[PDB]
Amino acid sequence: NLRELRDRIGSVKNTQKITEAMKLVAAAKVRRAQEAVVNGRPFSETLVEVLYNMNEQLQTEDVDVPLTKIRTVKKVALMVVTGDRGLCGGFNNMLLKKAESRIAELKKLGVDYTIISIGKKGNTYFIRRPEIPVDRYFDGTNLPTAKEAQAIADDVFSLFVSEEVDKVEMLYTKFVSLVKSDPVIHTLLPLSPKGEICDINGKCVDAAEDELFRLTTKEGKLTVERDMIKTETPAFSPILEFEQDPAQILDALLPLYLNSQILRALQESLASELAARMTAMSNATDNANELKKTLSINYNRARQAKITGEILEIVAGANAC
């Protein structure tokens, strides 16, 4: 039946057009998540302008702020930022491959891992196995705002200011490249008074230094390149007055600085999800192109063999009478 073979080509030609428009919808979304970080760029530039100078002015061993307070690591929380939807690479799988290896590492240390799951693809993985301690499930979101982030900040804040949990660490996918972006783990809490932000392994970047992702083109393709930007810290005026205390101002700055590392982790995990999907919809629309070509060739073989076999039945009957 050639009608069934024409329907298979017309649905693969439909599948090629769907999975190509999903590539461009994901191409519009990673660019819209590129823009969403640069909107939040004046906030964190000014917050680091403050936080480098409050640690400069302070110079006092008597100042201990409870988001910088170091306790003993008997328990450890881990917030994992997953995707909400499927069809995006091996994005959510390599993330939970990395979450399992951190659950494994804290059992060699024997220090009671704890999970905070964000996103529907983690809510599922974490709820499905009940022999894993999870505090709260969070609705993951596209376009995260301060409000969705504030709730995440609150769970992180209230779980740490009480002495049940030390060293809230976090693993998420930094958006490095389109096809390969490994999930790297950071230690969110306890914040460093310096504001240096560092990974669990032990590499700390200066916080005046953070890089934006800018999706551009190389030779033919669409690539993303992370340019490292240094913000210069001006000097706080000599005449400047402090309102409460340099310890009481710093106790209000670090909830702003903890809210910002959460929101930047959501927006870099968001662009990594939407570019894993753009990579997946690029490979699906090119596999469907290679399929549609060999279905068009195998149809024409069956089309021509049908006509040749049909006439040779007729020319045999035209001679046999």
Partner: protein
């Protein structure tokens, strides 16, 4: 022009006088209704229609003549009819009988339309005689003459010169395909013979796009030389903007996650397909077609829900018919979308949109 009364044909696949156009699709798609509503449109034009019905059920020949006699179409119509009970010689010679009657008026300076209700059944009726006459067959047991059957028929239908009197014979052969097999032997012949093809699809007939014209695949080799100057101006925008909507059919599921340059094109193209929808045996006059495409291709339907785009244009076509009758005289006589009539039409839209919003 040969005004068929359908917007999807007379704007984008225009049939002129002297043109052989092909109405083609699978069964129960609306091929007869495209041909019947074309005959029903020329009650005011002085064309003479010949409706040749080869190999049909006799009950459906009686329903077409009943449709024609009610709407006054038989004052200018011959129905040639060979029911499927008849011998294959009568079915083979029935469009040649219809074409000989249409050549009578054409040589007497009169313009004519002819419709062959399935050339597919004529080819099967000449295959019947040829296989019984022991003539050696080809693809699908047809003889070699089945191209020369239909090319000897359809080339008799064209437009004459002023040295003969400029009679025309516009052939609209209807060919039925089998599961959309355009590459089948009798569709392959007539697509080669005919200027234009009007592709009718059952996946648009079930979705509500009626008449189910697949305007993307359908072509017209005469092109815009058929259309009047009023229709060339307005349907230059309908062709481009339904082509921009054709590239964005994959994006209609994702209208939110897009910029405004793309999302307005998805919003415009979904109302431009509501322009094309006509009920059966409701052909539009050329003035009513220019209003409908000027309104849709110039932003005056973006405020409406798709349930109301049908109800708005029916009330706006009956508005200008009554309240603003000076518009029809500009397009009937000058046959150009003049800057006077573009001003007169916009006054009708903003008064109808005010009355339609109140409702």
């Amino acid at each position: 022009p040969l005004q068929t009364g359908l917007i999807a044909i007379d704007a984008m696949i225009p049939v002129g006088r002297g043109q052989r156009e092909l109405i083609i699709g699978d069964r129960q798609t609306g091929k007869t209704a495209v041909a019947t509503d074309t005959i029903l449109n020329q009650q005011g034009q002085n064309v003479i229609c010949v409706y040749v019905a080869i190999g049909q059920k006799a009950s459906s020949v009686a329903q077409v003549v009943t449709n024609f006699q009610e709407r006054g179409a038989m004052e200018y119509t011959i129905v040639v009819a060979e029911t499927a009970d008849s011998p294959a010689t009568l079915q083979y010679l029935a469009p040649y009988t219809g074409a000989a009657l249409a050549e009578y008026f054409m040589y007497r300076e009169r313009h004519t339309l002819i419709i062959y209700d399935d050339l597919s059944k004529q080819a099967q009726a000449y295959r019947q005689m040829s296989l019984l006459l022991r003539r050696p067959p080809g693809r699908e047991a047809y003889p070699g003459d089945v191209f020369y059957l239909h090319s000897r028929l359809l080339e008799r239908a064209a437009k004459l010169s002023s040295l003969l009197g400029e009679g025309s014979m516009t052939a609209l052969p209807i060919v039925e395909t089998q599961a959309g097999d355009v590459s089948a032997y009798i569709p392959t012949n007539v697509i080669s013979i005919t200027d234009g093809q009007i592709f009718l699809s059952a996946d648009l007939f079930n979705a509500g796009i009626r008449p189910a014209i697949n305007v993307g695949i359908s072509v017209s080799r005469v092109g815009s030389a058929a259309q009047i100057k009023a229709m060339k101006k307005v349907a230059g925008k309908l062709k481009l903007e339904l082509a921009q909507f054709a590239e964005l059919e994959a994006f209609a599921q994702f209208a939110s996650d897009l910029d405004k340059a793309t999302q307005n094109q998805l919003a415009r193209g979904q109302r431009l397909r509501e322009l094309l929808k006509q009920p059966q045996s409701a052909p539009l006059t050329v003035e009513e077609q220019v209003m409908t495409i000027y309104t849709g291709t110039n932003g005056y339907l973006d405020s409406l829900e798709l349930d109301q785009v049908r109800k708005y244009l029916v009330e706006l076509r009956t508005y200008v018919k009554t309240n603003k009758p000076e518009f029809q005289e500009i397009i009937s006589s000058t046959k150009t979308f003049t800057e006077e009539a573009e001003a007169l039409l916009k006054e009708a839209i903003q008064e109808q949109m005010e009355r339609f919003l109140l409702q």
